[PDB]
Amino acid sequence: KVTTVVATPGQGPDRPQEVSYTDTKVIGNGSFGVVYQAKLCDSGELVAIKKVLQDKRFKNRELQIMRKLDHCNIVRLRYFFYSSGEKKDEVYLNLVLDYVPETVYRVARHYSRAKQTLPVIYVKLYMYQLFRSLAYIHSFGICHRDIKPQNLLLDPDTAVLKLCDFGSAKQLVRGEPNVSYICSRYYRAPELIFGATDYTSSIDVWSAGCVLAELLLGQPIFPGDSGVDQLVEIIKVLGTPTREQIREMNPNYTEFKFPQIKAHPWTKVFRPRTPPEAIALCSRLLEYTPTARLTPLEACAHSFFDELRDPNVKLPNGRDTPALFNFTTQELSSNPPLATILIPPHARIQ
Numbered sequence: 613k614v615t616t617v618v619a620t621p622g623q624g625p626d627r628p629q630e631v632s633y634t635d636t637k638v639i640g641n642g643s644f645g646v647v648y649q650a651k652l653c654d655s656g657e658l659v660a661i662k663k664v665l666q667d668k669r670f671k672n673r674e675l676q677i678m679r680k681l682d683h684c685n686i687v688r689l690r691y692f693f694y695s696s697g698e699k700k701d702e703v704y705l706n707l708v709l710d711y712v713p714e715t716v717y718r719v720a721r722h723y724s725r726a727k728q729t730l731p732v733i734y735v736k737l738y739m740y741q742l743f744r745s746l747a748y749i750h751s752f753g754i755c756h757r758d759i760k761p762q763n764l765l766l767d768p769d770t771a772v773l774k775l776c777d778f779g780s781a782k783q784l785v786r787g788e789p790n791v792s793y794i795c796s797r798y799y800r801a802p803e804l805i806f807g808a809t810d811y812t813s814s815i816d817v818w819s820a821g822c823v824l825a826e827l828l829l830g831q832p833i834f835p836g837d838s839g840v841d842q843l844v845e846i847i848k849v850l851g852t853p854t855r856e857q858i859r860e861m862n863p864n865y866t867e868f869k870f871p872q873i874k875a876h877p878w879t880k881v882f883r884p885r886t887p888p889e890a891i892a893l894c895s896r897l898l899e900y901t902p903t904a905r906l907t908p909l910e911a912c913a914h915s916f917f918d919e920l921r922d923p924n925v926k927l928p929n930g931r932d933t934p935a936l937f938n939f940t941t942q943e944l945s946s947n948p949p950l951a952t953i954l955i956p957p958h959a960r961i962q
């Protein structure tokens with residue numbers, strides 16, 4: 613059983629290609645629509661196909677963003693094409709992507725269920741690779757707006773991490789306002805809970821901070837069914853925000869009196885042998901004030917990741933670490949001087 617389409621390649625020029633695939637399973641649907649898995653007939657390589665309804669007014673914002681992206685830590689759009697199903701009179705956009713077997717979510721929870729934490733080496737690798745992907749897209753003025761473990765793909769063998777689901781992703785432009793109903797429940801930044809629409813890309817950094825902590829703690833750090841329940845868990849950890857800070861998050865000061873709690877000494881939040889540089893990093897991402905949070909690029913160059921810049925560092929299975937230092941000038945444009953930290957001596961050797 614074999615389907616053959618004519619699909620436009622993700623990057624490169626408009627050179628339509630005949631693509632045949634088979635073994636079409638399904639792997640979840642959800643809001644957008646269905647996601648299939650298939651095997652490309654010639655190469656035998658696995659792909660994921662995200663099939664979503666195509667709006668007849670505007671062209672699809674996810675697609676437009678995916679074509680402008682090329683980065684080692686972002687899922688590759690191989691092809692995209694259009695189809696339907698039965699009479700319908702409605703058109704579907706099909707995004708063909710490189711299949712990646714695992715996700716941080718699934719892995720994180722395998723370790724959680726078997727009451728263990730992920731080895732810190734894997735935490736470093738995954739987090740670094742995320743911040744690179746954020747650094748890259750932020751450099752185009754694009755915010756993901758839905759950083760969460762379920763959207764961090766993994767190849768367990770290679771330790772390669774790839775950011776996916778660009779369905780909420782959008783070119784943020786200072787002056788222009790954006791919907792405050794975007795990010796998933798536990799990974800929402802305070803300014804989003806307070807319903808701000810003047811938010812920047814720093815929401816992604818908050819979100820990432822929540823992922824780090826969760827990998828350290830082995831469970832979400834800021835849980836809760838309601839905005840209120842979450843804000844409590846945040847206040848418990850960060851302490852009660854000063855009148856200034858609330859003014860910085862959402863200036864519209866939504867109008868609630870929070871209970872007055874002191875900051876829980878950040879070190880007293882995690883397991884006893886938790887690397888202190890990991891803890892430091894957390895607190896520089898999970899800041900109330902959006903501007904006071906590290907940039908992705910600054911985080912990549914944090915001391916917590918020093919072990920990745922060691923020339924001897926290998927994966928515990930023995931294979932080399934994946935690409936970590938092949939920065940582009942684009943990717944560094946945030947702050948080029950950091951190249952002196954990010955690209956270690958041993959990577960400059962000829």
Ligand SMILES: O=C(Nc1ccccn1)[C@H]1CCN(C(=O)COc2ccccc2F)C1
Nearest residue numbers: 639640641647660709710711712713714715
């Ligand atoms: O989704 C996957 N890979 C993937 C996705 C998109 C692009 C490239 N690779 C794999 C990784 C682990 N997987 C899954 O979690 C199983 O599939 C899903 C189940 C429920 C909702 C959504 C789902 F995608 C299947």
Ligand SMILES: [Cl-]
Nearest residue numbers: 626627628629
């Ligand atoms: Cl042609």
